[PDB]
Design a binder for these strands. Structure first.
Ligand SMILES: [K+]
Ligand SMILES: [K+]
Ligand SMILES: [K+]
Ligand SMILES: [Mg+2]
Ligand SMILES: [Mg+2]
Ligand SMILES: [Mg+2]
Ligand SMILES: [Mg+2]
Ligand SMILES: [Mg+2]
Ligand SMILES: [Mg+2]
Lengths: 97, 85, 95, 41, 291, 110, 87, 252
RNA sequence: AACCCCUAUACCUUCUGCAUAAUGAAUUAACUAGAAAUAACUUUGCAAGGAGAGCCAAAGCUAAGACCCCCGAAACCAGACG
């Protein structure tokens, strides 16, 4: 029970598909391009996460600030509750003070 | 998912569609224009800058209106901009 | 303490501490003595003089006051005619 | 990334291998065998 | 001659450096501690019951109910009005001399905030309530350069060191907006705003800057000869005649009190794209910027 | 960073000397920093570990260590405690010796 | 393969639609046009005359100056009077 | 045929001497030894810092990673508002909601909470040093080849494949021209049909590509570009504001 | 030589102390619990400066690594439905 009885379908990786072969190209776009662009401008993703990092409370606060006016009501309500929950957790509970 | 437009802009998007779109421009201008009401139930600063008496520094001041409730009966009379507080 | 603010995700300063203690850049904290303005009529001049001193905190209190204030309150300042200017740096201190 | 244990079978047999000569349910049921194998060692 | 080349030639005989044989520097990647296994699981470093094991101990500074240490000390205005006190980045005559000796500040031309910032001699933070540089005396004995330097505050002994070498020093006030512009001109020009007027000092600073003993930029020029003579008598040097020097014209260059940059007037727009300068000619505008 | 002007007399009023030309004939080399100073820094940990670091060392760093051992042995009365970091070209000494080491490396042509 | 063209800063001023409801209100002011002029100069297309305050704006600048920034003589006069009272 | 002799443009430290590489050509199979190029020792003979390569390789791999993994907490799973049964009396374990992480179909206690960013920035000087080290390492291990240009006699990929096999260039080759627009159309046609021979402009060079490919091919214009860009970081002041704004001597 | 011989007071939790006749557990499978600042430390870079405006600097400063759980009331309030 719990362990598969046949080998899984073999996994073939093309180590030289175009995505892998060109990975990292232009990561020095600033230092090699007269700093017209910053490498963070190459990051694609949510508008609230490009070239920025934080813990989960900071991300939720940042997402609420920037796209919160555009969120669906159920999702915005969950985000409000999540911020409140993390607010209590990070400010009032834990081993260290 | 996200909405393309902020929800608070949805009412304004509606005015660009349908019968509202075809309303006369001068009427549509009146709607958009949200002029500040004359202060009635609060006393305005009268200036943009004031000296903070506690620390003696020039600080900016703002007039924040007092929310007013206008009962439906006021829409049949002329209360001069007064309402319930 | 507020380790993470709801608006900025930043730790906040306890303003009670700012109103009572002075931080020297070297990491020492200076306080007044408790009761230096209370019932002076019953205190001896030797006691009154002790009560008027500006005194240093111990390591435990220093570490505590450091944690209750943010980094802004530890920066070197260059106030003109600061009465405490010479007390910001240590001299001849070994270990 | 959801990681689940995949070789738990082999972890279990490492105890059960020493319990096979015991009597009763403590020769096959890990919960019971693990305690009697520790005592045996 | 040795280890340097000994490493590159030692690399020739090794496998190729690839993405398969890299590693962090030893000591750079401390291991993670997880609550798993005998040593770190079970109670997992949190102790046994109480508030601490349950994660509910009181805030920082609370002492269990005893009126806490940070509350029972009396309030005293150590930090009252800290945010409106003016700060001055000190510039030493040791540091000024060093900047000149290394070629980072040019003594052949007037030295003001822009030249000290651009030579990376001082770092000014107007947002942290810096009001400029105070010229401090440290290094006065060994200071030899002759300069025309403009600071915001200057010590008498610092002034004596400047003037003993045949140099000139004036103290000038910069309001926080003017200070921000004078410190980073290029970012301001990228705002496309007319150059503003440099404001006057506040009252409490008007006596400092109208006083010749401070070489104030609003001080009476006719009173400077005496004040320069007093320091020479006080400190025992012979005041040089700077009118006789060939750089005398340079040594006399001073900005107008309402002027932020040498050679540029209030109300001009710097067009860095086309390398042009636009001057308004409207009378009302022109009167505003000259007033 | 501008290259330093030529001065009629050295050291300059500030005390700065340029590196010797031609470079000294030694197994190791100490390059100057981007601001043209000798790369000797004092460092502190734990509030009590006074340390001097010599950076930007080329060539044989084990020869530089022996020289620093022999220069500082008389001053200390014993052999200095040192770390040789071949990878980074850095010598680390226990104790503050920044001024002595600067004046000594400057008299070598570095 | 060959790499895609390097990502480059789209040249020239970016003038947004003053009608699209999703254009930031900060990209539509006179201050935004002033920055476009400063970055690109005449190629921006901004009339340079719009860079100085208008007559009504100039009146507001001068009024705030008179109220909050007194003359040198006024401040010297104030210090003289204040000094006599202390003396 | 006069040799192509490239000298270093930027001043070399007196105590150091330039390193050298054959200048080669892709115009024929045996057109090696077309010249001799000096290379700046501070760019092509720096200390071999593999620890810095790992730093820069990991910054490249991770700094742009956005994770999109996400689980629902007990707060976000559908329903689950009511207390399933009374606290006392039933002889069951006490439970507050059917979506606790103990229940099948419950919330996840400490699951991924994406989208999660991994953005960080190694100091610019470290990032520039990683480029030098990779170049120094390629030269030192005989994996670097300098060409005068990347022009081919034909745009046929088999030629470029056969040419690499003849010259013992390895399985993967990274071609660096100076500019994207001014790449010879022949090398563009050959590399576009290949998987392990990759053509990039100079501005796209990076530690991850140089490590992924076994062989690194640089035209001579590229070398001058690289020496200029990387040696600039060694002599620069600390910035006063972003280097994208006007400076006295920058760019060029 | 399976047993007979000899030795041997399940386990977890909880406790001053548990074979305890104290807790929990039929058993199997699967699921099910340590989240992060301050400072410090370690390892690089640059260094009287550092940092890709802001912020720090009386060897600092940048970067990185490394750190703070789970389930459970009786309640309280708001709006519905009876
Ligand atoms: K018992
Ligand atoms: K018991
Ligand atoms: K019981
Ligand atoms: Mg039961
Ligand atoms: Mg008991
Ligand atoms: Mg029992
Ligand atoms: Mg019990
Ligand atoms: Mg039972
Ligand atoms: Mg209540």
């Amino acid at each position: 029970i719990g362990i598969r009885l046949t080998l899984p379908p073999p996994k073939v990786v093309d180590r030289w598909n175009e995505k892998r072969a060109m990975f990292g190209v232009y990561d020095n776009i600033g230092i090699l391009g007269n700093f017209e662009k910053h490498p963070k401008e190459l990051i694609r993703g949510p508008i609230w996460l490009r070239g920025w990092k934080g813990n989960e409370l900071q991300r939720c606060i940042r997402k609420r600030k920037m796209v919160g006016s555009r969120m669906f009501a159920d999702d915005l309500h969950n985000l409000n509750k999540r911020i409140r929950y993390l607010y209590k957790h990070f400010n009032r509970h834990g081993k260290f003070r | 998912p996200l909405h393309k437009y902020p929800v608070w802009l949805w009412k304004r998007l509606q005015l660009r569609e349908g019968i509202c779109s075809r309303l006369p421009g001068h009427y549509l201008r009146s709607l958009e224009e949200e002029r500040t009401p004359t202060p009635v139930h609060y006393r305005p600063h009268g200036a943009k800058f004031k000296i903070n008496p506690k620390n003696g520094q020039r600080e900016r001041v703002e007039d924040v209106p007092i929310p007013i409730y206008f009962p439906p009966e006021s829409q049949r009379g002329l209360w001069g901009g007064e309402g319930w507080i | 303490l507020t380790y993470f603010s709801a608006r900025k995700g930043k730790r906040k300063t306890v303003k009670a501490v700012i109103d009572r203690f002075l931080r020297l850049h070297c990491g020492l904290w200076v306080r007044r003595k408790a009761g230096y303005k209370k019932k002076l009529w019953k205190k001896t001049p030797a006691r009154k003089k002790r009560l008027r001193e500006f005194v240093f905190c111990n390591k435990t209190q220093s570490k505590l006051l450091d944690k209750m204030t943010t980094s802004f309150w530890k920066r070197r300042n260059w106030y003109v005619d600061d009465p405490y200017q010479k007390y910001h740096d240590r001299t001849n201190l070994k270990v | 990334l959801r990681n689940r244990v995949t070789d738990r079978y082999f972890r279990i047999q490492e105890v059960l291998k020493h319990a096979r000569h015991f009597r009763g349910r403590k020769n096959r049921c890990y919960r019971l065998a693990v305690r009697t194998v520790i005592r045996a060692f | 001659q040795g280890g340097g080349a000994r490493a590159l030639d030692l690399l020739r005989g090794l496998p190729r450096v690839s993405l398969a044989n890299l590693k962090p520097n030893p000591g750079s990647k401390k291991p993670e501690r997880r609550p798993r296994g005998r040593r770190r699981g079970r109670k997992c470093g949190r102790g046994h019951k109480g508030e601490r094991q349950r994660g509910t101990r009181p805030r920082l500074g609370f002492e269990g109910g005893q009126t806490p240490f940070y509350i029972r000390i009396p309030k005293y205005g150590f930090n009252e009005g800290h945010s409106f006190r003016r700060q001055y980045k000190p510039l030493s005559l040791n540091r000024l001399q060093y900047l000149i000796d290394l070629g980072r500040v040019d003594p052949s031309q007037p030295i003001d905030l822009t030249q000290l910032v651009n030579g990376r001699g001082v770092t000014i933070q107007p947002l942290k309530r810096d009001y400029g540089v105070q010229l401090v005396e440290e290094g006065a004995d060994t200071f030899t350069a002759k300069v025309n330097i403009e600071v915001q505050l200057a010590s008498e002994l610092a002034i004596a060191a400047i003037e003993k070498n045949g140099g000139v020093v004036t103290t000038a006030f910069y309001d926080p907006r003017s200070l921000d512009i004078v410190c980073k001109p290029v970012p301001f020009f990228l705002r496309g705003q007319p150059i503003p007027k440099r404001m006057l000092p506040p009252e409490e600073l008007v006596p400092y800057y109208t006083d010749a003993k401070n070489r104030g930029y609003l001080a009476d020029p006719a009173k400077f000869p005496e004040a320069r003579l007093e320091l020479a008598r006080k400190y025992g040097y012979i005041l040089p005649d700077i009118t006789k020097d060939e750089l005398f014209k340079m040594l006399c260059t001073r900005k107008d009190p309402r002027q932020i940059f040498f050679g540029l007037a209030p109300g001009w727009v710097v067009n860095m794209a086309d390398k042009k300068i636009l001057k308004p000619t409207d009378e009302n505008l022109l009167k505003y910027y000259t007033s | 960073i501008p290259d330093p002007p030529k001065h009629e007399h050295y050291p300059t009023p500030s005390g700065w000397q340029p590196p010797r030309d031609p470079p000294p004939n030694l197994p190791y080399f100490v390059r100057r920093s981007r601001m043209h100073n000798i790369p000797v820094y004092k460092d502190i940990t734990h509030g009590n570990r006074q340390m001097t670091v010599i950076r930007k060392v080329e060539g044989d760093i084990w020869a530089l260590q022996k020289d620093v051992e022999d220069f500082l042995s008389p001053l200390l009365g014993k052999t200095p405690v040192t770390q040789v970091n071949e990878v980074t070209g850095t010598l680390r000494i226990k104790g503050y010796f920044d001024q002595e080491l600067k004046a000594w490396l400057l008299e070598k042509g570095f | 393969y060959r790499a895609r063209p390097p990502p480059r800063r789209r040249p020239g001023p970016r003038w947004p639609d003053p009608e699209d409801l999703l254009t930031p209100r900060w990209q539509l002011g006179p201050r935004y046009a002033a920055k476009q002029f400063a970055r690109y100069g005449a190629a921006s297309g901004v009339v340079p005359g719009s860079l100085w305050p208008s007559p009504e704006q100039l009146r507001e600048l001068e009024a705030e100056e008179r109220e909050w920034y007194p003359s040198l003589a006024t401040m010297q006069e104030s210090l003289r009077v204040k000094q006599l009272a202390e003396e | 045929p006069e040799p192509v002799l490239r000298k270093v443009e930027l001043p070399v430290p007196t105590h150091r001497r330039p390193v050298q590489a054959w200048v080669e050509s892709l115009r024929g199979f045996e057109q090696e030894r077309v010249g001799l190029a000096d290379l700046h020792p501070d760019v092509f003979a720096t200390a071999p810092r593999l620890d810095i390569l790992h730093q820069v390789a990991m910054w490249q791999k991770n700094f742009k990673r956005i994770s999109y993994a996400k689980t629902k907490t007990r707060a976000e799973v559908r329903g689950g508002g009511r207390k399933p049964w009374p606290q006392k009396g039933t002889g069951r374990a006490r439970h507050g909601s059917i979506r606790s992480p103990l229940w099948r179909g419950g919330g996840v206690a400490h699951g991924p909470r994406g989208p999660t960013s991994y953005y960080y920035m190694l100091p610019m000087k470290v990032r520039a040093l990683g480029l030098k080290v990779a170049l120094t390492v390629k030269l030192a291990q005989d994996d670097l080849h300098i060409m005068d240009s990347l022009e081919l006699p034909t745009g046929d990929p088999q030629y470029l494949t056969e040419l690499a096999h003849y010259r013992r260039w390895g399985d993967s080759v990274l071609l660096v021209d100076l500019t994207h627009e001014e790449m010879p159309q022949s090398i563009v046609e050959a590399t576009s049909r290949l998987k392990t021979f990759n053509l990039i402009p100079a501005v796209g060079l990076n530690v991850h590509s140089m490590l992924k490919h076994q062989t690194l091919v640089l035209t001579l214009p590229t070398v001058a570009f690289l020496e200029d860009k990387l040696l600039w970081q060694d002599s620069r002041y600390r910035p006063l504001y972003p280097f994208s704004l006007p400076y006295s001597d920058f760019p060029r």
